[model samples]
Target: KLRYAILKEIFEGNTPLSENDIGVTEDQFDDAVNFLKREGYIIGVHYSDDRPHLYKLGPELTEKGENYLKENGTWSKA
Candidate 1:
């Protein structure tokens, strides 16, 4: 569902995204972010890279997250 949608965004890139990139609006974005973080599927970092953040945030998919998508299937970009 939408929660998985959030996961998809982070999986594509090891960094945080704007509402545009997350494919959600400003209002709904925070709730999705909180949901992902609370679920322990996404981490906000690039394993100690130079660019420590993406838009002052880093939300990347964890192994659990990858397993989920691989098992359940990813959402269509369109």
Candidate 2:
């Protein structure tokens, strides 16, 4: 899913994702954020001094999330 892909990108330190970076449309990016947040696999912080930031493998990941990545390997996107 795009959420997984997006999270993997964030985990890799691709912050403040620019248009050229992910190639996804703004709507798709919003959808990815919503899905990740709902799944409890990501966290967001909107600091007053910086753009909102996101983190993956957040506090709620079950063994399943790690195992999924272990089984599937690290993530990458075009």
Candidate 3:
């Protein structure tokens, strides 16, 4: 799902994407955004005159979340 893609970008340290930056259709992007927020993996802020901005990667991963990703090879070594 796009949630994994979005989380990958965030974990890679990019932050605050516009709708265009995410390269998904608005509806797809919005769904991914909502899912991430619901999962506590991200948060959003609505600006008065712009699209809502999302903060990436959250504060840190939970132990279970981290281990699962690691075991699943979700993260790659640079």
Candidate 4:
């Protein structure tokens, strides 16, 4: 649920999000983000060289992610 929650926030915000913005610890955030990316649920620029792993602006859900959200009842075709 934590991972989905983060995804949901990103979807709703329409922008990249950080662990701090999501109120998740760095480890949790990175783990969730990595899982989402690995699973092909989302996409965005990721970098840690500047400041301990972060998502650059424009992180958003992919079509797969949107479909998942629909299946999860978090969204509908709109």
Candidate 5:
């Protein structure tokens, strides 16, 4: 899912990825980001614009998010 893919980027400290960085359409990224924010899976500064971007200060996973990946076997073992 794009949600998890976005989460992985944030989890790996790749914050502030524009539409180009994620290799997805802006709308697609926005939808995924909206889901993550609505679900409390990610948090940080959001720069709203016609072409919005997230975590201007760096995005990080919430407890729920970390638990999600851990349960799904995607959390980093290192």
Candidate 6:
């Protein structure tokens, strides 16, 4: 699915990446984030500023997320 494809980039990309840097559509980015969070694909984290609303990549990949990559072959394409 396209969500998995987009998620592939997130998995491979450097930590602390922004949604903009990840190239998600501006309008749909929040929706995508909401969708991912609600579905348990990702857990949101905060930036160094301690901003309550900041979404950063200091994330812990859930077992489900890790298993997904393993099943699909990792971002390393191994």
Give the Å shift of residue 31 in candidate 6.
2.3
For 1-78, candidate 2 gives per-residue lDDT tens digits of 666666555555546564236767666776776665666555553334343334332324445544555655555554
Which residue window of length 10 is worst by lDDT in model 3? Answer: 43-52
| Residues 1-78, model 1: lDDT tens digits | 677776666666545577776677765766666666678777663434433234445566778877887866655753
Q: lDDT of each model, Cα atoms only? A: 0.63, 0.54, 0.54, 0.71, 0.72, 0.55
Per-model TM-score on C-alpha atoms: 0.64, 0.57, 0.54, 0.72, 0.73, 0.55
- Cα displacement (angstroms), candidate 6, residue 44, comes to 2.4
Residue-level lDDT of model 5, residues 1-78, one tens digit each, is: 667766776677567777657667888888888788888988774656654466547577899988887766563432
TM-score of 1: 0.64
Q: Please, what are the lDDT tens digits per residue for candidate 3 over residues 34-77? A: 66566665554333344345555333444543443455555343
TM-score of 4: 0.72
Model 2 stretches with alpha carbons more than 4 Å out = 45-68, 71-78
Clash pairs (backbone) in predicted model 3: none
Clashing pairs in 6: none
**Backbone clashes per model, in order?**
1, 0, 0, 1, 0, 0
**Which ranges of candidate 3 are over 4 A from the true structure?**
44-51, 55-78
- For candidate 3, the clash count comes to 0
Which ten-residue region of model 4 has the weakest summed lDDT?
49-58
User: Per-residue lDDT tens digits of candidate 6, residues 1-78?
Assistant: 445555566676645545566666644555654565667776764424433223444555667766776776543421
Better of 1 and 3 by lDDT: 1
RMSD score of candidate 5 (Å): 3.4
Native-to-model Cα distance after best TM-score fit, residue 73 in candidate 2, in Å: 3.4
lDDT for model 3, on a 0 to 1 scale?
A: 0.54
Candidate 1 clash pair list: 44-58
